[PDB]
Amino acid sequence: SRIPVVLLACGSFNPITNMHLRMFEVARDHLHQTGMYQVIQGIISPVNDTYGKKDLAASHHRVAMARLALQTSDWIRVDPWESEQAQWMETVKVLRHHHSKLLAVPELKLLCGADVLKTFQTPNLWKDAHIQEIVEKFGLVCVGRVSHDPKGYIAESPILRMHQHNIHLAKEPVQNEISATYIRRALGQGQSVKYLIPDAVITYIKDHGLYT
Amino acid sequence: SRIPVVLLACGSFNPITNMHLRMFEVARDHLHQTGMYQVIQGIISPVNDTYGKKDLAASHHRVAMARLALQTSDWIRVDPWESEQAQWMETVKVLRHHHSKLLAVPELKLLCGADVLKTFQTPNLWKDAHIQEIVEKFGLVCVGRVSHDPKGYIAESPILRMHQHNIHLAKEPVQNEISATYIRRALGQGQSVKYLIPDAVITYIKDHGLYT
Amino acid sequence: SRIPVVLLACGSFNPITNMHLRMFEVARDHLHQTGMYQVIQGIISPVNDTYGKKDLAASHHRVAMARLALQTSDWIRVDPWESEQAQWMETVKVLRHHHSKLLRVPELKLLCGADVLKTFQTPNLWKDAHIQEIVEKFGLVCVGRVSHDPKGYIAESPILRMHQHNIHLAKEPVQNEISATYIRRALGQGQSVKYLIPDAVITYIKDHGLYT
Amino acid sequence: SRIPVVLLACGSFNPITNMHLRMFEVARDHLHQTGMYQVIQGIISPVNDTYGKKDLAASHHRVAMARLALQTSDWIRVDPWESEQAQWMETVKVLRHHHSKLLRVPELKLLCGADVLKTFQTPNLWKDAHIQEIVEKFGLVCVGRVSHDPKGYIAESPILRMHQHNIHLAKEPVQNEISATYIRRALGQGQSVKYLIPDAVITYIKDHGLYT
Ligand SMILES: Nc1ncnc2c1ncn2[C@@H]1O[C@H](COP(=O)(O)CP(=O)(O)OP(=O)(O)O)[C@@H](O)[C@H]1O
Ligand SMILES: Nc1ncnc2c1ncn2[C@@H]1O[C@H](COP(=O)(O)CP(=O)(O)OP(=O)(O)O)[C@@H](O)[C@H]1O
Ligand SMILES: Nc1ncnc2c1ncn2[C@@H]1O[C@H](COP(=O)(O)CP(=O)(O)OP(=O)(O)O)[C@@H](O)[C@H]1O
Ligand SMILES: Nc1ncnc2c1ncn2[C@@H]1O[C@H](COP(=O)(O)CP(=O)(O)OP(=O)(O)O)[C@@H](O)[C@H]1O
Ligand SMILES: NC(=O)c1ccc[n+]([C@@H]2O[C@H](COP(=O)(O)O)[C@@H](O)[C@H]2O)c1
Ligand SMILES: NC(=O)c1ccc[n+]([C@@H]2O[C@H](COP(=O)(O)O)[C@@H](O)[C@H]2O)c1
Ligand SMILES: NC(=O)c1ccc[n+]([C@@H]2O[C@H](COP(=O)(O)O)[C@@H](O)[C@H]2O)c1
Ligand SMILES: NC(=O)c1ccc[n+]([C@@H]2O[C@H](COP(=O)(O)O)[C@@H](O)[C@H]2O)c1
């Protein structure tokens, strides 16, 4: 039988976009195509507001937009736990929490874009022990992104190389590089972002005057 | 006052995708940013089935998918006229028809991707007299596409160069090259295309067993 | 033993660029990795001047630039035959001519980008009989390009899908979308195109006042 | 009269590629088109070997390749100072050193791709004081890259948006996303990278057995 799997996506989702959502679908199909996995659930976990960030909309709104975006999904849900904590928590800790939650046990994997993988190389950004635990105890499902070479990042990292069987590279012959940064600026300029992010999310942004 | 404008998009829409729809939004914002136009409507006109094509799903289905995709749009509608004709009609004729329909009169412009513009250079593809009438009597709103240089196509074409004031180049700093061809193959392989095309279109394709 | 292969690329090469050149290298590495072939030579064949077209520099200029571009190549060369003919010639006929030369035996395959492959669908652009001869008698090596889905073009063409064993899809993991149209416009504006096309081609362009 | 400018690019240049080089040309053409400047020289400054990093070839090798790459450049040169220092140095400090050299006056601006600009947000990666000195004392010229929205990074950074007059966004109309990570992996697999990086750099790599 196929190993059951839960995909966990950490990040800003400021706001959640069609590409963030597309990421989950590509990862699930890739894992199923291997013939040894069955993805049973996806989790969108918005980052805590304390994460010293450019400036994110309040997490209350980011969780809301994700919930609304996921209404038409029968397997992906938002989980506010991470954003409800008194403060920012390292990713490996969110994985531990959601793993405990799950506790015949499905494997919990971190779903991210290849760019995140490139950041593992940034000095002080990630603790080597976290990089190791993330790839060894949980797993990584990385979706391709233009300009990044996931296979090379893996080969050049002693830690990732050693646990590469637990890293799954997925990529669809599509080219969709819509950045939430662009989305925010377009919204701020009164321009349309329709068809770049869900209609339900555009409605919420309009109703609550976000990204002005 | 701003000149009123109707955007007409001709093509396969086999099936209509988020990018086809995105094209309309980018064009409208570009025309409004000029300060001299007010886009009052968009028309999606699926190509007749007789158009000797690879093989398109029946036009009945393509019109349906467009209608469903456009349910959440308050300014874009599908018009089956072109596909209901006994046979394929040159684009300039569809423009004339929709122009007559409109008949204090708004300008009707052909909305297309920069790749279509590149095809004007293909021998026998378009009649020079049609290329001229299309750009002179109606107008062109072209949305950028990776790999194409619209400005160069215009400069190297005596006809387009002469009527370049009637060609409007729009492009959003986004990279979305999802091809309907890829969509069809993904569907045929049982893979997800969710978030690449509208949920309402995926539902119809599933219910009617299309693209198998 | 490996099947000896010769790759032929037809196109305007107006001017030849680094992507044109990259195409040969990618196609060769791909054929070699199959293990069934051994590419022994590449041939750049500039189209004839009568090819009812845009802003096409005189053929001898395009042959000379390709030649300068190829000086650092140990296996690729430009063959002026096609451009030196009196009139334009369908591509199958260029494939027959070079097939003849090969006999004063290596397999002669047509090398092109995915965009060319999509043109096989354009009404009346190619004779079905020619598309068949190309992939049945000779062979087709296609390099990926952004926005194109080669596998889908092949599956949807009743002619191509029957000859899949002779069609090789070479994947381009590097986003390298340089447009010659862009190259020409930039030059005409006095902007740099260095590192986009060969240094010697740039010098030649300048010395002969091309693309102004 | 025009303000004399010197462009400084810091990075690993491991190895230097055609996109790295293209970056200088694009930035120069952009500064010149403003009319307020006249770029008099470009400087490639390879990072020091102690830069806690990946698979970094010895600095003298990276300086030599950059030098071979720059032989056909009449205005760009590599300066080994940074790599020849004893330890790694924050970029502002490299900007001060070269600012000093300039005085044995030209404006010294930091040249980088949009992706670098997005890293100014990464927690603790850059000192706010340094980001300020960079765009207040010196200046920043940024070349566009796929998936990045520079205008948005600038607007959302309270530091950057205050110094917009010293930040220049150079647009790259050519999709040229070459990854050095990819270059290295391809080489290690014995695949060609010709036309992606300079011929002489390839020769040097081979002669010194780099990236195997
Ligand atoms: N277009 C895309 N394709 C593939 N993955 C993407 C993607 N856009 C975002 N992602 C991934 O989605 C996850 C969350 O992204 P975010 O934290 O929202 C940064 P972003 O989406 O780039 O917006 P930004 O502009 O605020 O940085 C990350 O793993 C990121 O790699
Ligand atoms: N991703 C994209 N970005 C901008 N324009 C696009 C686009 N995809 C399609 N278009 C435009 O939408 C119009 C209709 O396209 P279609 O006739 O459906 C061809 P297509 O969308 O490329 O699907 P295909 O794979 O069947 O060729 C054309 O003007 C085309 O240029
Ligand atoms: N950037 C690129 N990547 C992959 N293939 C490319 C390419 N640019 C051109 N080609 C391929 O090179 C061959 C000849 O191309 P050309 O006839 O010169 C069209 P082009 O290079 O786009 O110039 P154009 O814009 O003047 O038409 C074709 O097979 C084409 O697909
Ligand atoms: N393809 C590209 N287009 C535009 N800028 C690029 C580029 N590739 C690299 N650069 C720029 O060149 C400078 C130095 O880059 P490097 O430090 O070598 C990272 P890289 O080139 O991506 O190699 P890497 O994959 O080993 O990290 C940076 O400003 C970077 O943005
Ligand atoms: N060391 C860590 O655990 C670590 C470091 C950087 C980013 N992250 C996470 O990655 C996601 C995206 O972060 P960025 O916005 O910095 O790219 C967030 O959920 C963030 O918490 C975790
Ligand atoms: N000469 C003409 O009027 C002409 C030529 C080619 C395509 N078209 C139109 O462009 C749209 C897309 O055509 P393709 O599927 O061939 O790219 C269709 O609506 C088609 O009718 C019109
Ligand atoms: N019917 C045919 O054999 C046919 C049709 C179109 C293009 N071609 C060739 O393929 C290349 C296409 O170049 P363009 O797309 O710039 O016209 C040229 O070499 C051209 O000669 C051949
Ligand atoms: N805080 C700083 O001054 C700082 C931080 C990160 C990178 N850098 C520099 O910018 C370039 C970045 O290279 P990488 O992204 O490969 O680390 C290097 O030259 C590096 O030295 C400087």
Taking an 8 Å cut-off on Cβ atoms, the answer to whether A147 and C173 are in contact is: no
Q: Ligand 8: list residues with CB < 6 Å.
A: D 10-12, 47, 51, 90-91, 125-126, 130
Nearest 5°: phi and psi at A62? -70, -40
Q: Is B76 annotated as a binding residue?
A: no
Q: Which residues, at least 6 apart from C209, have a Cβ–Cβ distance to it below 8 Å?
A: none
Residues near B134 by beta carbon (within 8 Å), at least 6 away in sequence: B91, B92, B95, B110, B140
Are A196 and B22 an interchain contact pair (Cβ–Cβ within 8 Å)? yes
Q: Does the beta carbon of D13 sit less than 6 angstroms from any atom of ligand 4?
A: yes
Element (H, E) at A184: helix A180-188
Atom number of ligand 5 nearest to Cα A93: 3
Q: Is the CB of A45 under 6 A from ligand 1?
A: no
Minimal Cβ distance to C196: which of D22, D73, D177: D22
Atom 11 of ligand 7, residue of closest alpha carbon: C11
Residue of D nearest to B171 (CA): D173
C149/A173 CB distance under 8 A: yes
Q: How far apart are CA B177 and CA A176, in angstroms?
A: 6
What is the token pair recorded at B92? 């300039």
Cα distance between residue D104 and residue D51, in whole Å: 28
Establish whether D75 is an annotated binding residue: no
Virtual CA dihedral for C52, C53, C58, C63, nearest 10 degrees?
Answer: -100
Mutate to test the interface with B, among A174, A179, A182, A201 (most CBs of B within 10 A): A174
Q: Is the CB of A126 inside a 6 Å radius of any atom of ligand 5?
A: yes
* C-alpha to C-alpha distance for D18 and C195, rounded to whole angstroms: 6
Residue A139 to residue B209: CA distance in whole angstroms: 36
Between the CA of D61 and the centroid of ligand 6 the distance, in Å, is: 54
After which residues is chain C discontinuous, taking C to N > 2.5 Å? 104
Q: How many other CB atoms are found less than 10 A from the CB of residue A206?
A: 11
What residue type is assigned to position A170 of the chain?
A: A
Output the CA–CA distances (angstroms, integers) from residue B167 to B162, C63, C92, D56, D81, in the order listed: 10, 34, 37, 49, 52
Rg (CA), chain C: 17
Distance CA(A123)–CA(A140), nearest Å, equals: 20
Mutate to test the interface with C, among D20, D71, D147, D174 (most CBs of C within 10 A): D174
B182 is in an annotated binding site: yes
Q: Are D87 and D50 in contact (CB under 8 A)?
A: yes
Instruction: Quote the DSSP letter at residue A197.
Output: B
Please give the C-alpha separations between residue A67 and each of A8, B194, C99, in angstroms, as whole numbers: 15, 17, 62
How many interchain CB pairs under 8 A, A with B?
A: 65
Could you give the CA distance from residue C87 to residue C94 in angstroms, rounded to a whole number? 12
What type of residue is A133?
A: E
Q: How far, in Å, is the centroid of ligand 8 from the Cα of D46?
A: 11
Per-position DSSP letters for chain B, written without gaps between them: -PEEEEEEEEE--TT--HHHHHHHHHHHHHHHHTTSEEEEEEEEEEPPTTS--S----HHHHHHHHHHHGGG-SSEEE--HHHHSSS---HHHHHHHHHHHH--PPEEEEEEEHHHHHHTTSTTTS-HHHHHHIIIII-EEEE--TT--HHHHHHT-HHHHHTGGGEEEE--S--B---HHHHHHHHHTT---BTTB-HHHHHHHHHTTTT-
Q: Using CB atoms, which residue from B156, B177, B179 is nearest to C55? A: B156
Task: Give the Cα separation of C204 and C201 in Å (integer).
Answer: 5
- Tell me whether residue C40 is annotated as binding: no
Residue in the structure block whose two tokens are 């004709």: B85
Q: How many CB pairs below 8 Å do chains C and D form together? A: 63
Q: Which residues contact A51 (CB under 8 A, 6 or more apart)?
A: A88, D123
- Determine the 3-state secondary structure of C150 from DSSP: helix
Range of the domain at B135: 1-212
Q: What angle do CA C13, C17, C23 make, to 5 degrees?
A: 90
**CA distances from residue D92 to C68, D9, D127 in whole angstroms, order as listed:** 42, 12, 10
Please answer whether residues A42 and A24 qualify as being in contact, where contact means their C-beta atoms are separated by less than 8 angstroms.
yes
Nearest by CB to residue A174, choosing from B21, B25, B177, is B177
| Residue written as token pair 């400036």 | A55
- Secondary structure class of C151 (helix, strand, coil): helix
Q: Ligand 1 pocket, A184 CB below 6 A? A: no
CA distance C24 to chain A (A): 21
- What's the CA gap between D139 and D142, in Å, rounded? 10
SS3 C98: helix
**Cβ contact C179:D174 at 8 Å:** yes
- Chains in contact with B, where contact means 3 or more Cβ–Cβ distances below 8 Å, are A, C, D
Give the Å distance between the CA of C119 and the centre of ligand 7.
Answer: 9
User: Which residues in D have their CB inside 8 Å of a CB on C?
Assistant: 18-19, 21-22, 25-26, 28-29, 72-73, 146, 173-179, 182, 191-192, 194-196, 199
Say yes or no for a CB contact (<8 Å) between A54 and D115: no
Q: Copy the structure tokens of residue C107.
A: 């397999």
Give buried/exposed letters for B21-43 (b at 16+ CB in 10 A, else e). Answer: bbbbbbbbbbbbeeeebebebbb
Classify burial at A143, counting beta carbons within 10 Å of its beta carbon; exposed 0-12, middle 13-18, buried 19 or more.
buried
- Residue A173, classed as helix, strand or coil, is coil
Q: Please, what's the b/e burial string for A160-174 (b: 16 or more CB within 10 A of its CB; e: otherwise)?
A: beebbebbbbbebbb
Nearest CA in chain D to A149: D182
Q: Under DSSP, is residue C41 helix (H, G, I), strand (E, B) or coil?
A: strand
Report the binding-site residues of A for ATP: 20, 54, 118, 181-184
CATH code, domain carrying A207 = 3.40.50.620
Q: Which residues of C touch B51 (CB under 8 A)?
A: 123
- Chain C partners within 8 Å of D22 (Cβ): 194-196
State the structure-solving technique. X-ray
The one-character DSSP state at C194 is B
SS (H, E, C) chain D: CCEEEEEEEEECCCCCCHHHHHHHHHHHHHHHHHCCEEEEEEEEEECCCCCCCCCCCCHHHHHHHHHHHHCCCCCEEECCHHHHCCCCCCHHHHHHHHHHHCCCCCEEEEEEEHHHHHHHHCCCCCCHHHHHHHHHHHCEEEECCCCCCHHHHHHHCCCHHHHHHHEEEECCCCEEECCHHHHHHHHHCCCCCECCECHHHHHHHHHCCCCC
Q: Which of D147, D149, D175 sits opposite B146 (nearest CB)?
A: D175
Mark yes or no for CB contact C192/D29 under 8 Å: yes
Write out the DSSP string of C164-193: GGGEEEE---SEEE--HHHHHHHHHTT---
- Cis omega (within 30 of 0) for bond into A4: no
Pocket test residue of C91, C116, C117 for ligand 7, highest count of atoms within 8 A of CB = C91
Q: Do A22 and B182 touch (CB under 8 A)?
A: no
Encoded amino acid at A167, one letter? I
> How far is ligand 6, taken at its centre, from the CA of residue C122, in Å?
9
Residue A53, CB half-sphere, CA atoms under 13 Å: how many? Answer: 18
State the distance from the centre of ligand 7 to the C-alpha of B9, rounded, in angstroms.
27
- C90 in contact with ligand 7, CB cutoff 6 A: yes
How are strands ordered across the β-sheet holding C140-143? C76-78, C37-46, C3-11, C107-113, C140-143, C167-170
Q: Which of D17, D8, D4, D10 is nearest to D179 (CA)?
A: D17
Q: What are the φ and ψ backbone dihedral angles of C80, each rounded to 5 degrees?
A: -70, -10
Number of domains forming the structure of chain C: 1
CA atoms D197, D201, D206, D211: torsion sign: negative
Contact B20, B70 (CB under 8 A): no
Residue B54 annotated as binding site: yes
Candidate from D12, D88, D93, D133 with most ligand 8 atoms within 8 A of CB, to mutate? D12
B-C contacts (CB, under 8 Å):
74
Say how many C-beta atoms besides its own lie within 10 A of residue A139's C-beta: 23
Give the DSSP letter string of B157-191. Answer: -HHHHHTGGGEEEE--S--B---HHHHHHHHHTT-
Q: After which residues is chain B broken (C to N over 2.5 A)?
A: 103
Q: Which residue has the tokens 């390009």?
A: C145
